[PDB]
Structure formats: structure tokens, C-alpha cells
Design a binder for this molecule. Structure first.
Ligand SMILES: CCCCC/C=C\C\C=C/C=C/C=C/[C@@H](SC[C@H](NC(=O)CC[C@H](N)C(=O)O)C(=O)NCC(=O)O)[C@@H](O)CCCC(=O)O
Length: 154
């Protein structure tokens, strides 16, 4: 697969310059806010390892993913994921803006039950108590993300 699924936003001109994968894909990231959310809200901790591997506590069971760059879409990654209930899926993401040490705003998109992909904007924080950073104010305005939903971390 050489480009993100049709229907997913490639965010051309909207992704940060100079993304440093080595500084992003290290340590833990808590998913604290998102544009769209479900109930009940939860606190997903994304654990990263070498070679774009990650683990997180998903809605029904732990999830393990293996990432790779998407050849045709700068900044995008494809993650092949499996869940402890026996599920498997492919999810795409790009880091829109991050300071690596505190926050990261991501775009995520993938097929999840239909030909029409579902997408979202996600705010990750290094601390479970993290909220909306001042540094993202202008970017959130530009993307019309002025009321992110708080999830289940504190
Ligand atoms: C450090 C940050 C790294 C970021 C890495 C980026 C992407 C890879 C990681 C996670 C991806 C999660 C995707 C979840 C799918 S849902 C994806 C999938 N579901 C299906 O594919 C179901 C298919 C069909 N609906 C069915 O019922 O069979 C599934 O089983 N998910 C389990 C679960 O969510 O716990 C939806 O809940 C997403 C909804 C919109 C969104 O928030 O993106």
C-alpha cells in the first residue's frame, strides 16, 4: 500500500516541518483529548519501542502495532495492529505538531467497519494530567479544533 486510504485527509501544507521520528517514537504517550470521542471515556497509554512498534490498552484488550512509513504521503505512517480478542486492523497517522517532551497533535484515519474511513484528531500528552498546550492555540484554530473532547486520563 503506497498511499493512505481514499477519504483520508493527507493534510498537505498542514503538517509540521522537520519531524523527528526518533524523538517522537520514544517513551509513553497518553491519549488525553480527541475531536470525536465515544463513551465511556478511557485513558489509553501508548507505549513505544524501536522500529515503530507500539502497544496500547485498547477498548477491549491490549493492542500491538507495527508501523511503517507511507511512501506516497510525507509524514504518514501505516500501523498494522492485532488485538488480544483476535482482531486485526490497519490504521494511518501523521504527527501534525509536537514538541516531543510534552504534547503531540496527531491525525488518524483508517477503515473500521466500512468503505468510508473514520478519522480523528488526537491530542497526546507525556503526562496523564496533560491538557491543551498553549503552543497549539493557533494550529488548533487553523484546523477548526476549538473544542477537543477530554477523555478519561487525569
Ligand atoms: C503514539 C501514538 C501512536 C498512534 C498510532 C496510530 C494508529 C494505530 C493505533 C491505534 C488505532 C486505533 C484505531 C481504532 C479504530 S477501531 C479499529 C479496530 N476495529 C475494527 O477494525 C473493526 C472492524 C469492524 N467495525 C468490525 O466490527 O469488524 C479495532 O479493533 N480497534 C481496537 C481498539 O481500538 O482498541 C477506531 O476506534 C478509530 C476511531 C477514530 C479514531 O479515533 O481514529
Amino acid at each position: 500500500v503506497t498511499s493512505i486510504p481514499t477519504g483520508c485527509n493527507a493534510l498537505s501544507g498542514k503538517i509540521m516541518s522537520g519531524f523527528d521520528a526518533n524523538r517522537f517514537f520514544t517513551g509513553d504517550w497518553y491519549l488525553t483529548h480527541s475531536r470525536d470521542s465515544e463513551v465511556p471515556v478511557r485513558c489509553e497509554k501508548y507505549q513505544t519501542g524501536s522500529n515503530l512498534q507500539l502497544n496500547f490498552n485498547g477498548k477491549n484488550g491490549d493492542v500491538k502495532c507495527s508501523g511503517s512509513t507511507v511512501s506516497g504521503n510525507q509524514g504518514f505512517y501505516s500501523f498494522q495492529c492485532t488485538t488480544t480478542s483476535g482482531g486485526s486492523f490497519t490504521s494511518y497517522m501523521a504527527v501534525v505538531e509536537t514538541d516531543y517532551a510534552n504534547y503531540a497533535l496527531l491525525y488518524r484515519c483508517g477503515l473500521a467497519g466500512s468503505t468510508t474511513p473514520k478519522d480523528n484528531f488526537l491530542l497526546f500528552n507525556r503526562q496523564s494530567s496533560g491538557e491543551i498546550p498553549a503552543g497549539l492555540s493557533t494550529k488548533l484554530n487553523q484546523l477548526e479544533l476549538t473544542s477537543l473532547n477530554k477523555l478519561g486520563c487525569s
